[model samples]
Target: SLSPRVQSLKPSKTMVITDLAATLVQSGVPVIRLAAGEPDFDTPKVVAEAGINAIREGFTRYTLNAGITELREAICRKLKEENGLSYAPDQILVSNGAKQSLLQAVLAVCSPGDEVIIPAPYWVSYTEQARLADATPVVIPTKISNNFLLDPKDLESKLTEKSRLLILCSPSNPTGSVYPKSLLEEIARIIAKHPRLLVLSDEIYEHIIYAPATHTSFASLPDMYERTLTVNGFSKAFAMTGWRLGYLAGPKHIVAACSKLQGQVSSGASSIAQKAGVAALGLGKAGGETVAEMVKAYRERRDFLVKSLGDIKGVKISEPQGAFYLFIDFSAYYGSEAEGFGLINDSSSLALYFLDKFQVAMVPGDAFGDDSCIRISYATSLDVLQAAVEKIRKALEPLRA
Candidate 1:
């Protein structure tokens, strides 16, 4: 019942983590999922109350196809204050989620056969979305040594006349690498040379940044303001994933085009959710103390995970700057037999080994284009992560012989 391209589309690697975790749990196994991006926290109280009030006031009709003006203006105002991004409300388009906002951007700008450049170990959805839109994904691999950040020269080598878009995921998924301003400026310069190139900057994890890592938005740049589509949502920052609200702020034309595509699809985002989104966006520093508190906890968890995992035999990790994940290197285990179980041949096999033996679940690194690695999310509680890492360490213990 799916399209041919979609029929060939693999299951989401991120969801695979969730699936395996569920299977283990259903089987009565005590498994921890360090593979989730969703916050363990619930939606903030004030935001939830606004949505309830909207429902109480009978504001259930379809919004203006793009979104409610009040919410859009709030998005505009919030961006201006937080990131110094000042865009007209017309330049923002509301979508079902951040994923939809990204899809709409691709559909609006990319023609079939266009090539979109992305960095290595990219968010998996980016490549799949390119396929759905009939675009080719060109990658410039950034090694773990480089903080998984791309070099502008590598990006330039991949650029062609058909290169229509370049994606930037700050506090990137899996790797948790944050692109600093210096690195961004270099890439931005290369992008500027190709005026046709639009940068799809996914800043969903913007608010989750830790110390020494600040999120610098592309639209915050003076020259590239018109070419950057800043994709953000309520999912990450406010823990409102189920409400499914996200928005895009970019050049007026790009925003309008995405809105056109959205209108023919879902009509508009959920009306009640938009009301809650307004409240979330209006949250001042005091209102989002929860986010600050969560980041503090994440920092502590990261330190512990890094320190403990370091003691594991043959494990190498890239120090993460932001985001709640670590793309770990486990190449040392490949080709070695693990006795009674399967050999550590590839990422999938190792993943299964960990799952079957110690009952610790993690996404295979192959999903993020690195077979020699695996992704571990630090979004879980301390007790759970402690147990999972211990299991992983134990799973590798036999291999030390």
Candidate 2:
């Protein structure tokens, strides 16, 4: 029998758009899919070659519960060099991926009825992971005019005696909005108000940033050194999602708990992958020139897609300063009919419409706690990105009439 908690868990509706798109393609429709949140590029050649080398050298075996020591040290070095966060190897817990790191952190800190404040237009998985951990997720709704950012006052309003943690996603998924350092500092002040409160800051997209914006790890701020659990990984930057290596850096006690939990479940991430991870951090970013090039490519694609969509009508769009997504507000098309499914009054309809008629897939805003917009990932190739935009543009233009 499944645990009641498992039964209570709803499947992620976020992937519905992608699944629908896939079905149409299988049925002979030529769909331009912009739904899935994955990089179009292959994992950096150097990173891949490192893994191959590790395998050739007979490095295949179960690694330590936390991860390979060298990889953990590499993670520590990256944090110190990139974000100015100082964490010894003992304070870092490596797991399957950033997803696992976040989940483990929540499980380690959260209990049934515990509350974790999540800014709306947040990542889909954050809410689900909180629910899985038996913690209530407080959704703090943000607005487009404010650049889709959460206000500390709103976060404070939701704080209660049961509020145990705040899971903040900088360069948030779906919205693609990065929290400003000033805002983090302000949030840090508020979080300090409750000593029992823990902070899970997911900075997975720390490397893919655009002009006039920069990422600031919350853990790097004053008084946050001990309280913030910084979640990051090689999945995004090195395009190593399949390698499945990620880590969390925090106080040693919390990291130890995370390691223990990881051991009970998966034992450890792949040893071959951890060896590659060592190269990913130490060589891929530090020694090789691939990272700068990848960042450039992402920036180019991000700007091009945002500009192309800007030419279209009926949606309010902003160029994200970091990450690889464009969250567009389709409020004008909200009341329009979608695929004859009655009135398209919300973001879900827009998603379905785009997938079915246009053959262009996008995740709805409802999945991200805002029913006024939809999310399109720019992590695809240039030609595909252009085509996807064209399909979405033509598909939505009739609603503008």
Candidate 3:
């Protein structure tokens, strides 16, 4: 038996698809899961060594509720030097990963009837986390033509008296669309008029960006620092997803509230991970040469995917400026029937068709609140991506006839 709130939860689509693909592989089947958002790279040596060193040095004991002083101070230094935002150690709450930090922010700030404004296609967790907090999720749709960016005009139209929080992700998960600074400035102007509307800037993908498409921390904007909660971690850019190290930086009051909530839910993230996080930061600017090399590999894979996938007929793709995902509009395959498979009427069915026939797994865009597209994560090797492209093209050839 489960509570109403638990029943209301939707399975994280990426996790579900990844599990299914993995299960098949475990069963002696060959399934290439391009569905997962995780980096295939190993955690950097410096970071890994720090964790081992911490264990050896007896630093594995419980740390302060916020984090170890050294780590929190390092976090503040990172925010100041890279993000152009100043934060004290007390204003930062390190948690079990950015995912927990995000959920805690929603729970700390939102009330039962309050609204959490989210733009789609969004990361799958945003709406679910809002529901977990008993707050309503207000999804505003963005089009593929716009590179899936949230239109300030659309955001302006959706605000009501109950509106309380707005979530923005740059170098987004489902769509690799990065919000440009000028557009954030336009949106920030509107946010200024609404005093109660708070912004959660998820900058987890901050350093994974391609050149000429730089990231702008929303809190760094004029007068927005007080109104924005910045969430980042040593996950994506550092290739340490399993390390479960993430943090939130914001105003003293809000940060304290999150820390208070965290104290009851889970104590400070792992003491060992915190030490490793400190080492990850010390590697240098934008995670130093280690992450830069990963970015170069990702860009090469993205280029290959965009060009190869674009060659397919009826596939509409937006060149992602940052992150390692390609959100392509494959709605053209909808309403077509495939041999031995029932009608492929939507993204879910079309995705199933590919998995069933070609053993290629990709996430349908519906899970991100956009049904016209599906997301392809290029976090794997170029050779694996090339094989996936060939399989997908062959899978769709008959449907295109």
lDDT to native, each model: 0.85, 0.84, 0.91
Residue runs of model 1 more than 4 Å from their true location after superposition = 1-4, 13-17, 285-287
lDDT of 3 by residue, 1-401 (tens): 89999888887655666677788899999998888778999999989999999999999789999999999999999999898889999999999999999999999999998999999999989999999999999999998888899888999999987888999999898899999999999999999999889999999999999998999999999999999999999889988899999999999999999999999999989999999999999998888888999999999998899999998899999869898899989998888889999788888888888887899999988899998988888999999998999999999999977
Top candidate on lDDT is: 3
Candidate 3 residue pairs that clash: none
Candidate 2 lDDT, 1-401, residue by residue in tens = 88887887767777677777778889888888787777888888877989999999999988888888888888888888888888899998899989999999999999899998888888878888888889888988988887888888888888898888888887878777888889989989988889889899998988877767888998888898889999999888788888898899999999999899998879889988998888788664433577777778888888888788877777788647888888998888777865465677788887887777778888888887888888888888888887887787788777766
Q: For candidate 2, which ten residues in a row score worst on lDDT?
A: 282-291
Candidate 3: stretches off by over 4 Å? 13-16
For model 3 the TM-score comes to 0.97
C-alpha TM-score for every candidate? 0.96, 0.95, 0.97
Model 1 weakest lDDT span, ten residues long: 282-291
Best by TM-score: 3
Would you list the clashing residue pairs of candidate 2?
Answer: none
Q: Per-residue error at 116 for model 2, in Å?
A: 0.7
Worst 10 residues of 3 by lDDT: 11-20
